[PDB]
């Protein structure tokens, strides 16, 4: 038996996502300048920070 | 679950000249009751309806999937309608003679 | 599998059952969780694209190859700028060479 | 006056399935899915077959003599206000292999009816699922019409 | 003040 | 349309990445793009009646990349028909392989 | 009050608009007893408009109540509320009346005295 | 002032300090570390005891319920006071649940400072 | 400000409460708007000086800093003679600017 | 009398300091001293964290299963208060567990799920941030 | 697993691109905005002389207009009457007779199509739920299907098609037998004026301006209303639309008669706005508006929106009334007012009338004397009232009279003192705090043997309201406490024994500081008890906040005690009190997350009054700068060099020898600086240490300072021009002689181009 007349939680059991994974990063271009050599990119932190 | 512009009416323009009510009718039963349909008649609101839908949500959903639709080698341009002045006054008369049915009837005062 | 777990259990995959491989993966799986992935799900033919780029940018590419945003980032080089400074002998064995006693600050962890 | 109480009000219930100003009783379990398997009722008048229909693309359809909520109004008197629910729910098995995996199958509940629905032209015991397989029959209040469950490939 | 916290943390003030 | 439109843009954009003296020409091409940004309706606007009506174009110039072995062509589009042409790049890409219709032998893929 | 560029659009009608005839005899109101007109002049509008508007009822009250009161304004006032010929006969109705219930020595107006 | 304007300040407050960039330490939920009660103000008056719970248990165990009815007619005068487990969950509570509309009223909730017990 | 054309004083009695500038607005006349030869100071009206009022620019509307004056021609033609000289209207470009700023950033 | 009144009000003030904060300082209280009474420093083979490193239950290893089996056979056997089960909660910034008569319905106003994001945001401007300022370099 | 690639974990991406629109900054309340209609045409009672009017006229009158009312109120009653025995809802045919425009063709299909319809509805459970490589057909009707105004016309939207769709079709004038719609269409130059480059805007809003007579009234503001009704306005576009309104307001004078309610309904909700222009600009054409359409018709327009259903249109229908009693004058209005305001059927209309009268105290301020007591007499009645609400707004009238009547009038409030004083002591909640905020405001306009037992009686109920929960109620406490215990007839030790402890108790938190209008209610009466009870009282209470962790707290006690220090100075400051009042100031200088001039100001004014007590301490004030000069972000630099031309006054006049040569020479080896906003700071550094110790001793002196500043005029920055420029006519003036002829016609040179 399944009790009924209890409210709805419009929910599913499909995976869902922790909403601290996502967004932590950000743009749309590749990370190369479009090519250009002459700036400063090897690195992705701060080097003590 | 609507946003307040969605509207039982909606204004439809790119219809071919002169299509056939019957079409018009089932194209857009496509979704499900249509209350009422106008077609312009002079040049300048040749080619364009109003169309005005008895439930809110025919109406929105009718806007969300045919809004884009290709029939006689042109797109169908859609709209909500913006209901916003009237154009003749409301008849008191047969306003308060409807309403005074209302309370003769079901005993109110 | 984690997919499949997290659907089992209901519950929803944290950043914890992810942190393992997060720079893992050769699309880089930590590119499906960034900011764009809705409109870059949309950007299709780039590899092709940017590799006729070299007839209209007068600069030649070294990374025609990939995409930061689609591939990801496919390598890390943070641990060389710190055996580099220990190879050289350390900040201090570093600025033995350097006018850095000439500047009149006090220790060298604040300059900039 | 009243006293402090500690039970339920129908406020909550009400505000959640509420639906053209008739609180619904049941609603959507967590497992509800959309099926693939494109399923297919076929309804008799006592030997003269109607309409058929074709009930693949919600997760449930709910049935009962209150015709401008339900699906598919029953609408011979002995028929509940909202009566029963076809239902696609997501459950898992193991396979040949032991593999475990999930298909959306079709199950039936009675939403506490008063005469009862007939599976097999037996009643069931309301508030529960019932595993719908292939070929099944299946009766509303003492009506007159029945409903042959099938799959296109079946 | 700033100053005497300096010299209750270093020593005796 | 406005997702294949922003991603136009973006490329477009990658190549004044760096912002140097650039010039008239590479400071029209940004202020197009920016007012482009600023309002995409009326891009998109005349993106299409560019596709519908336009059939005769402005002169493009050419120059090559000294490469010391081999030497590369490279050519200068007018930024309006930059902007059409951008677009219009995208939307084929991602209908062509929606629709699939490049098998799986033609090779630079997204995929690998 | 500070601006030149627009008119007194009270002084344009006072020139432009067509008033009523009894609206000369100034009037003072010393003389006058109001809660016997009160009913008159309630009567008199709610019928002109089919129901009752107690604040159309009060403004020409308070319209009144003053020492000597400006015909002219008063019937511009009510222009808008009533449909403006019904207001010139309104006033040259009421305002007449005024002068009978004065030069009478009780202040009372001749209708009520004989009814 | 209606009690929706004291439901848009407590919102324009959080929204505030969010512009601002306080830290969580001095957040202005500081000022009551040492009270677990919050108020919640506006309620219908048909909720009971069992809907204010069944609503609010979301962000904790719920330790003690007052809700405040006109003696008289035993009716609800529509404001409750709810003393929850750990006062973290009252931090949630107002910055979750002000605002929210039950039944068309919109409730709104926010702390309280010297609770006395009746 | 001899150069809008689309603004108005009070116009009303004067008083005895000096007028101030604010500082954009600092060291100009009020009618003349002239930079030289400053004569007489500034008397508002009390409505136009009441409340918040107090301590404003005459021309400006912001924190008066200064006492306003009128040049030695305002002096001779008598143009100082007319009461609160406040512009109690705002103009089209402040709005005007105003919202073309709140467009752009 | 005052009996009584101190007794309820006692009770109050408590419940005011709720409960779970004070429980959390009486484990605090005897964790200090439990520390207190030991070496400064901590080696690896101190025989409690040797311990509590065997009972790390890891990932994908298939004894979780028997050594969850033993655990959840004996914590069966306890008079706990009831906690919630259903659909999983929603995520709160300090990982607190619903009341176990929370009807499952998630009635927030938007407000965690905001906070998670604007976090997640100023992180990623922190790296764009840092790689323009050394590219300029 | 490239299909989880394709699967999202969980659209328009431009939205950070495009400028606000109005209706974004909504609530429940202001939604009501588009929910109302342009009502139809209306008969304007003037015309024709006042004719005797020809009837059968569809042009509405007063009559029609309240028939329409209160039938719709019976129709609500009898609705929620029937919905107690048990927006969506369907219309009928004149309903949609009345929203479609003309020109159109009503047809159901078939018979069948209405019957399609009939089992559409019914049932759509799918009966069969329903390509391949085609080759295509050329044509050209794409192609031909046009959707932009072909001519020298603006980019039309995709959504002011409903507005101005007439434009797309084209077809020869001439065919276009009505000049009305000729005109019609050629008055659609307000898309070139709603959207447009500067040039056509300003041509077509000067032929608009000119042509407005022969266009009329009608066809304008037909077209024009509905898009400042459009829901997806923004603001640029509004703010256009409402000057055009008002430029052609002033044009026609008073061929506007038939359309003010329309012009009404649709600007009243500029007056309740956020954005203050918004809010002026509505003002003014609501005073033109009444301007040109005299009172008659004011009134009689807005007459039947007092007794309105609906709060929002009551609300702003009273503040647009005190507009026009602005504009036209209170004697003229005034027995409107007393009819409404004691209408005895509808408490609606006694609240929107008593409304009424605090808004004209709000708007008109000092100009109610005069009428004072007229408009006491219309209000006094409701503070007897048995509905709480009609009672709470008539004390708070009460009080917005007495604020606009500060001291005056005490004997025409006279009648009212009694009311309010019973009142406060058997009144607890809302109308506590309305009457508190009326008494206090009265407690001013009083003589002295009236305002000290009156004084002495609400302190009680004050001390008592410290405590109160309620946010308007703080508020209110907030200023009475500024206005009672700030008077001459109180006594020092009273306060600082009863009012300071729990007023520093429960005042000052972060919530105060949190909000916009009680932080500065709070820095106000805190200054006035500073008056009373001394500073170094206040100051002592409130000193260790400044090393406070919330940035915007600091800043609360920041402007404080610079406040009170400027006012009152510092000799009660003590020697341990100014100890922890340097250091504060110091500590709360080197936190600044913002940009801001408060710390800036506080710093200068403390020191400038502590005067020569300050010597003991330049040393940490100079150590301090000259380390923050060196830091790696240009915020802490910039702000750095703003202290230093603050003191430069002190530094000089405590004869810094060291330190001052220290701070010049300093300055000027910054001078090279690559941040405009720093090195305008530099400079404002230097001339404010040239100010004080002369051209003929500065340290660098001023042969070595102008080459060096010649090459920063060509900077094109707006800071360091001021500041150099400024620098430079220090030494043109003063110095002179120091500099060659050439240096000097070098200067002229590059000056002819800071002209720009
Ligand atoms: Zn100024
Ligand atoms: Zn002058
Ligand atoms: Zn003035």
């Given amino acids: 038996v399944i009790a009924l007349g209890v409210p709805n939680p419009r929910t599913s059991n499909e995976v869902q996502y922790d909403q601290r994974l996502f967004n932590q990063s950000k743009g749309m271009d590749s990370g190369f300048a479009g090519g250009e050599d002459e700036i400063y990119n090897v690195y992705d932190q701060a080097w003590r920070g | 679950r609507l946003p307040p512009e969605v509207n039982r009416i909606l204004y439809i323009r790119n219809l071919p000249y002169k299509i056939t009510a019957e079409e018009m009718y089932d194209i857009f039963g496509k979704y499900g009751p249509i209350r009422q349909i106008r077609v312009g008649n002079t040049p300048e609101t040749r080619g364009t309806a109003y169309v005005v839908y008895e439930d809110i949500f025919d109406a929105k959903n009718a806007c969300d999937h045919l809004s884009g639709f290709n029939v006689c080698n042109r797109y169908l341009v859609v709209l909500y309608y913006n209901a916003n002045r009237a154009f003749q006054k409301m008849d008191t008369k047969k306003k308060e003679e409807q309403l005074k049915l209302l309370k003769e009837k079901y005993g109110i005062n | 599998l984690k997919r499949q777990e997290a659907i089992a259990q209901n519950r929803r995959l944290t950043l914890e059952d992810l942190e393992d491989s997060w720079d893992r993966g050769i699309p880089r799986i930590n590119t499906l969780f960034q900011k764009d992935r809705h409109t870059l799900a949309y950007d299709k033919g780039w590899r092709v694209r940017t590799d006729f780029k070299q007839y209209q940018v007068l600069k030649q590419n070294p990374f025609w190859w990939t995409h930061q945003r689609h591939d990801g980032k496919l390598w890390n080089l943070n641990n060389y700028r710190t055996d580099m400074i220990q190879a050289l002998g350390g900040v201090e064995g570093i600025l033995e060479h350097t006018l850095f006693k000439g500047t009149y600050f006090p220790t060298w962890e604040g300059l900039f | 006056k009243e006293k402090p109480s500690f039970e339920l009000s129908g406020a909550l219930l009400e505000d959640t399935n509420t639906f053209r100003g008739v609180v619904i009783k049941y609603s959507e379990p967590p497992e509800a899915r959309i099926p693939k398997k494109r399923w297919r009722l076929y309804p008799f008048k006592n030997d003269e077959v109607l309409p058929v229909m074709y009930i693949h693309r919600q997760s449930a359809y709910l049935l009962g003599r209150h015709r401008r909520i339900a699906d598919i109004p029953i609408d011979h008197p002995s028929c509940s206000k909202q009566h029963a629910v076809f239902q696609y729910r997501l459950v898992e098995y193991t396979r040949a292999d032991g593999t475990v995996g999930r298909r959306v199958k079709p199950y039936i509940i009675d939403l506490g009816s008063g005469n009862g629905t007939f599976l097999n032209n037996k009643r069931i015991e309301p508030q529960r699922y019932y595993e719908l397989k292939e070929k099944d029959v299946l009766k509303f209040g003492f009506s007159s019409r029945e409903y042959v469950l099938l799959h296109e490939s079946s | ?13 | 349309d406005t997702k294949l439109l922003i991603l136009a843009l973006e490329r477009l954009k990658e190549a004044y990445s760096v912002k140097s003296r650039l010039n008239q020409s590479q400071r029209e091409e940004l202020g197009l793009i920016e007012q482009a940004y600023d309002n995409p309706h009326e891009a998109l606007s005349r993106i299409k009646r560019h596709l519908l009506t336009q059939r005769a174009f402005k002169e493009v110039g050419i120059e090559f990349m000294d490469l010391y072995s081999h030497l590369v062509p490279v050519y200068d589009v007018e930024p309006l028909e930059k902007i059409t042409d951008a677009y219009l790049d995208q939307y084929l890409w991602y209908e062509a392989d929606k629709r699939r219709l490049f098998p799986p032998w033609i090779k630079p893929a997204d995929t690998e | ?115 | 002032m209606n009690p929706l304007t004291k439901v848009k300040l407590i919102n324009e407050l959080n929204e505030r300090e969010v512009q601002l960039g306080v830290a969580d330490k001095v957040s202005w939920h500081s000022e009551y570390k040492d009270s677990a009660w919050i108020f919640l103000g506006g309620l219908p008056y048909e909720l009971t005891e069992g809907d204010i719970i069944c609503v609010f248990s979301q962000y904790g165990e719920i330790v003690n319920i007052n809700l405040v009815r006109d003696k008289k007619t035993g009716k609800s005068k529509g404001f409750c006071f709810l003393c929850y487990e750990d006062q973290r969950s009252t931090i949630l509570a107002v910055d979750n649940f002000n605002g929210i509309k039950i039944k068309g009223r919109t409730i709104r909730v926010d702390h309280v400072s010297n609770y006395r017990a009746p | 400000a001899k150069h809008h054309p689309d603004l108005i004083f009070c116009r009303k009695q004067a008083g005895v409460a000096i007028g101030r500038l604010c500082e954009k607005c600092d060291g100009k006349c009020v009618i003349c708007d002239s930079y030289v030869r400053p004569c007489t100071l500034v008397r508002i009206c009390d409505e136009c000086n009441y409340g918040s009022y107090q301590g404003r620019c005459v021309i400006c509307g912001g924190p008066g800093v200064s006492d306003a004056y009128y040049c030695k021609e305002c002096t001779i033609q008598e143009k100082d003679r007319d009461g609160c000289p406040k512009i109690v209207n705002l103009g089209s470009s402040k709005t005007d600017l105003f919202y073309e700023r709140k467009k752009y950033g | 009398k005052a009996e009584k009144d101190s007794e309820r009000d006692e009770l109050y003030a408590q419940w005011g300091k709720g409960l779970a904060q004070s429980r959390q300082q009486q484990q605090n209280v005897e964790d200090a001293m439990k520390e207190m009474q030991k070496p400064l420093a901590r080696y690896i083979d101190d025989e409690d964290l040797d311990r509590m490193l065997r009972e790390q239950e890891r990932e994908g290893d298939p004894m979780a299963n028997f050594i969850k089996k033993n655990k959840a056979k004996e914590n069966k056997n306890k008079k706990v208060r009831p906690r919630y089960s259903g659909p999983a909660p929603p995520p709160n910034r300090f990982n607190i567990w619903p009341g176990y008569r929370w009807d499952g319905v998630d009635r927030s106003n938007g407000f965690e799920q905001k906070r998670f994001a604007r976090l997640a945001s100023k992180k990623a401007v922190e790296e764009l941030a840092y790689k323009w300022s050394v590219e300029d370099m | 697993p490239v299909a989880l690639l394709n699967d999202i974990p969980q659209y328009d991406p431009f939205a950070e691109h495009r400028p606000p629109k109005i209706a974004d900054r909504e609530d429940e309340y202001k939604k009501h905005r588009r929910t109302m209609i342009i009502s139809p045409e209306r008969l304007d009672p003037f015309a024709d002389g006042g004719k005797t009017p020809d009837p059968k006229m569809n042009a509405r009158t007063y009559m029609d207009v309240m028939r329409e009312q209160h039938l719709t109120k019976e129709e609500r009653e009898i609705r929620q009457q029937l919905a107690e025995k048990a927006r969506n809802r369907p219309l009928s045919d004149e309903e949609l007779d009345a929203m479609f425009p003309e020109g159109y063709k009503v047809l159901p299909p078939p018979a069948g199509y209405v019957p399609i319809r009939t089992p559409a509805r019914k049932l759509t459970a799918t009966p069969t739920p329903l390509t391949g490589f085609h080759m295509q057909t050329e044509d050209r009707t794409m192609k031909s299907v046009n959707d932009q105004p072909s001519g020298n016309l603006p980019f039309l939207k995709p959504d002011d098609i409903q507005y101005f769709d007439k434009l797309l079709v084209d077809v020869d004038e001439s065919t276009l037998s009505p000049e009305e719609q000729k005109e019609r269409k050629i008055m659609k130059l307000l898309l070139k004026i709603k959207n447009g480059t500067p040039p056509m805007r300003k041509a077509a809003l000067r032929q608009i301006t000119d042509k407005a007579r022969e266009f009329g009234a009608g066809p304008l503001f037909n077209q024009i209303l509905p898009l400042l009704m459009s829901p997806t306005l923004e603001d640029q576009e509004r703010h256009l639309l409402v000057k055009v309104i008002d430029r052609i307001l002033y044009k026609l004078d008073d061929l506007v008669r038939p359309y003010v309610h329309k012009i009404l309904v649709v600007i009243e909700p500029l007056l309740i706005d956020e954005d203050y222009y918004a809010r002026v600009e509505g003002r003014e054409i609501i005073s033109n508006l009444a301007k040109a359409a005299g009172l008659a018709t004011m009134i009689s327009t807005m007459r039947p929106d007092i007794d309105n259903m609906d709060e929002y249109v009551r609300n702003t229908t009273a503040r647009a009334f005190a507009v026009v009693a602005s504009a036209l004058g209170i004697p003229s209005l005034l027995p409107f007012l007393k009819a409404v305001c004691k209408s005895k059927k509808s408490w609606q209309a006694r609240h929107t009338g008593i409304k009424i009268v605090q808004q004209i105290a709000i708007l008109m301020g000092c100009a109610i004397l005069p009428h004072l007591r007229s408009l006491v007499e219309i209000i006094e009645h409701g503070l007897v009232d048995e509905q709480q609400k009609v009672r709470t707004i008539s004390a708070l009238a009460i009080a917005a009279l007495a604020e606009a009547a500060t001291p005056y009038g005490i004997e025409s409030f006279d009648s009212v003192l009694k009311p309010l004083w019973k009142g406060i002591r058997q009144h607890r909640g809302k109308g506590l705090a309305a009457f508190l905020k009326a008494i206090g405001y009265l407690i001013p306009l009083m003589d002295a043997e009236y305002a000290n037992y009156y004084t002495r009686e609400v302190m009680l109920i004050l001390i008592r309201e410290f405590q109160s929960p309620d946010e308007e109620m703080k508020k209110i406490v907030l200023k009475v406490v500024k206005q009672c215990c700030g008077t001459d007839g109180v006594e020092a030790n009273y306060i600082k024994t009863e009012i300071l402890p729990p007023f520093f108790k429960h005042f000052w938190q972060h919530r105060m500081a949190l909000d916009r209008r009680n932080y500065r209610q709070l820095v106000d009466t805190t200054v006035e008890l500073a008056n009373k009870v001394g500073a170094a009282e206040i100051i002592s209470r409130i000193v260790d906040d400044l090393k406070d962790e919330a940035e915007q707290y600091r800043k609360m006690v920041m402007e404080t005690i610079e406040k009170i220090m400027g006012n009152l100075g510092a000799a009660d400051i003590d020697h341990k009190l100014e100890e922890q009042l340097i250091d504060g100031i110091l500590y709360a200088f080197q936190e600044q997350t913002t940009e801001d001039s408060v710390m800036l100001n506080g710093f200068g004014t403390v020191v400038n009054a502590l005067g020569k007590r300050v010597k003991p301490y330049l040393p940490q004030i100079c150590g301090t700068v000259l380390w923050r000069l060196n830091n790696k972000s240009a915020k802490v630099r910039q702000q750095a060099a703003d202290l230093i031309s603050r003191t430069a006054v002190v530094m000089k006049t405590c004869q810094e020898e060291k330190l001052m040569g220290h701070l010049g020479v300093v300055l000027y080896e910054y001078l090279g600086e690559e941040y405009p906003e720093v090195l305008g700071s530099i400079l404002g550094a230097l001339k404010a240490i040239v100010n004080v110790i002369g051209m003929h001793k500065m340290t660098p002196p001023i042969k070595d300072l102008l080459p060096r500043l010649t090459p920063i005029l060509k900077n094109r920055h707006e800071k360091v021009q001021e500041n150099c420029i400024d620098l430079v006519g220090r030494i043109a003036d003063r110095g002179a002689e120091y500099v060659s002829a050439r240096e000097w016609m070098r200067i002229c040179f590059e000056l002819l181009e800071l002209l720009k």
């Fill in chain 7, 1 to 115: 009050e500070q601006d030149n560029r627009f008119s007194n659009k009270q002084k344009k009608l006072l020139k432009q608009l067509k008033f009523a005839e009894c609206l000369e005899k100034k009037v003072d109101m010393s003389k006058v007893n109001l809660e016997v007109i009160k009913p008159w002049i309630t009567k008199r509008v709610t019928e002109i408009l089919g129901f009752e508007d107690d604040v159309v009822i009060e403004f020409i009250f308070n319209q009144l109540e003053v020492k000597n009161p400006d015909s002219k304004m008063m019937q511009i006032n009510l222009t808008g509320f009533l449909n403006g010929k019904n207001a010139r006969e309104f006033m040259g109705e009421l305002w007449p009346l005024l002068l009978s219930a004065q030069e009478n020595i009780a202040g009372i107006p001749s209708a009520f005295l004989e009814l």
């Fill in chain 5, 1 to 13: 003040t700033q100053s005497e916290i300096r010299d209750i943390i270093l020593g005796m003030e």
